Structures are given as structure tokens and as C-alpha cells.
């Protein structure tokens, strides 16, 4: 199916507690494969997926060089943004960046991304044209200007259409037994009286990969969006994810309710009911 690669950078200032921390992690879809942490005893790029371990010394050295350089420039960038917002030296602040490429089911580039945030708010993003920028405010307009002057977009476009896709494709092949394996959810419905006249039906999905899934309840075939309690999809810790959806129903009306499950790993979607 469709696949993506992303790198996530977090640079955090911490006045009085040393220089800003820089962390980078890399993902293919929902699988992390590398990390770098400037706070580590010996900061270097480390593998976090078995299929990446085969990459040679030059790969690891080159990654580590990039992240070490970014550790330094992101410290300067934090200084710059403090100034753009007229902020005091006392506060902690964070720049985040996420960038990468999306492939369609045939393996070709769908689109690229390079987005940054400051203190959790949109700051500047590369447009889908991979040629122009969207700046959130007048501070970000200053960054835009510098980036326009330095032809950053052109460089991002070259990476996103080139190296990004090429490497993603390589990882997909090297990790094909997992990265290209969809594991369907294991499902069941539970029943718990909440009173004499009402009970909870909870529809469970466990052990699935990737994280994307749809879990809905219907009553008499009508979606129950407003009445469904839906927890955020959560990692099990073994690569797989979990989710559930709950509905409180009048006692005696249980068979009027159906749980529906959509997941890439499902030969066909599921319809489930409580089985007393």
C-alpha cells in the first residue's frame, strides 16, 4: 500500500540547565528506525529497527554528522526566534520540525513535507509545490525571507523528490517482512451493566499494524458518532496498536448495535455484535 518516511526534530532551550537539547527520530510509517540525542553520553545516531542495522559505517557517520551540525544550528535558531518574538532569556522554548516524503501504492512520490513549529504552534511550512512557503506570522516571515534568499526550497525539493524517495524505497525492501506486512486487528465485544436499565458495549481491536484503523458503532444501522466513546489508538509495545469504542445502550436493545472495523490488514471489514 502507501508508505511514508518522516524525520522529527525537537530542539528545546532550558536556560540555567545547559545548552538546548536536540533530538531527532526517523520513522517509516509507524515504525521508528533511528534516533539521535545530543544529551546522550556519546551522542550518535543509533539504530532502532533491525532492518536498518545493515547500513554501513559511512551511513552512521554521515547521519551523526548531520545531527551534530543541526544540534548547533538549532541552538542559534532558538536564539533567533527568541528575538523575533521579543522574548526574555528566562523562558524555555521549543522548535519542532517534521519533514519527509509520501509514496503512493505504486511507489512513486505522492507529495513532500517540510514543516516547522515554535512552542507548539505552526511557524513555517513548505507548500505542496515544494517551491514556496507559508509563514504563520511576521516572525516566521523573517525566516521566510532568509530561506527565500538562501534558496532553501530548491534544496528541499531536490531531497524530497530524490534521496528521500530513494532511501524510503530501500528501507521498504530491506524491511519488507514487517514494513510491508499489515497485521489485522484481533477483535471482540464486551458487555458491562452500568445500571438496571443500561449496559456498556465495548468493541476492541488489538494487535494491529499499521496504526490507521476505523472503529464505529451503529444502532439500527445508523452511525452513533456522538454517543461513542473512542480512545486514542495506543501502542502495545511490540510494534502493534490497540483501540476500543464504547456505547451505552438500553438493556434489551443490545442486538440493535453493531461494531464495524476497517483496517488495511482486513481481507474484508468486520461487523461484530455482542455474543452473550
Amino acid at each position: 500500500g502507501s508508505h511514508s518516511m518522516r524525520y522529527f526534530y525537537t530542539a528545546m532551550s532550558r536556560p540555567g540547565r545547559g545548552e538546548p537539547r536536540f533530538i531527532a527520530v526517523g520513522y517509516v510509517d509507524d515504525t521508528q528506525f533511528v534516533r539521535f540525542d545530543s544529551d546522550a553520553a556519546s551522542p550518535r545516531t543509533e539504530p532502532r529497527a533491525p532492518w536498518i542495522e545493515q547500513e554501513g559505517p559511512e551511513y552512521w557517520d554521515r547521519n551523526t554528522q548531520i545531527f551534530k551540525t543541526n544540534t548547533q544550528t538549532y541552538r542559534e535558531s532558538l536564539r533567533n526566534l527568541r528575538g523575533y518574538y521579543n522574548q526574555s532569556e528566562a523562558g524555555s522554548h521549543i522548535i519542532q520540525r517534521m519533514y519527509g516524503c509520501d509514496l503512493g501504492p505504486d511507489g512513486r512520490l505522492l507529495r513532500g513535507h517540510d514543516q516547522s513549529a515554535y512552542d507548539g504552534k505552526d511557524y513555517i511550512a513548505l507548500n505542496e509545490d515544494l517551491s514556496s512557503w507559508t509563514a504563520a506570522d511576521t516572525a516566521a516571515q523573517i525566516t521566510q525571507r532568509k530561506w527565500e534568499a538562501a534558496r532553501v526550497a530548491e534544496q528541499r525539493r531536490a531531497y524530497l523528490e530524490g534521496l528521500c524517495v530513494e532511501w524510503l524505497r530501500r528501507y521498504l525492501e530491506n524491511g519488507k517482512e514487517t514494513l510491508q506486512r499489515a497485521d489485522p486487528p484481533k477483535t471482540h465485544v464486551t458487555h458491562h451493566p452500568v445500571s438496571d436499565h443500561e449496559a456498556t458495549l465495548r468493541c476492541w481491536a488489538l494487535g494491529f499494524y499499521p496504526a490507521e484503523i476505523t472503529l464505529t458503532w451503529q444502532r439500527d444501522g445508523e452511525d452513533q458518532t456522538q454517543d461513542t466513546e473512542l480512545v486514542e489508538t495506543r501502542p502495545a509495545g511490540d510494534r502493534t496498536f490497540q483501540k476500543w469504542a464504547a456505547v451505552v445502550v438500553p438493556s434489551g436493545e443490545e442486538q440493535r448495535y453493531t461494531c464495524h472495523v476497517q483496517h488495511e490488514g482486513l481481507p474484508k471489514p468486520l461487523t461484530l455484535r455482542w455474543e452473550p
Binding site: I66, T73, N80
Partner: peptide
């Protein structure tokens, strides 16, 4: 593989 920044890259 991450993108390499140009020298003196800054916000």
C-alpha cells in the same frame, strides 16, 4: 536518510 543542511543554516 535525513536531509543535509547547507552550511550556516538558520531560522
Amino acid at each position: 536518510h535525513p536531509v543535509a543542511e547547507a552550511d550556516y543554516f538558520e531560522y
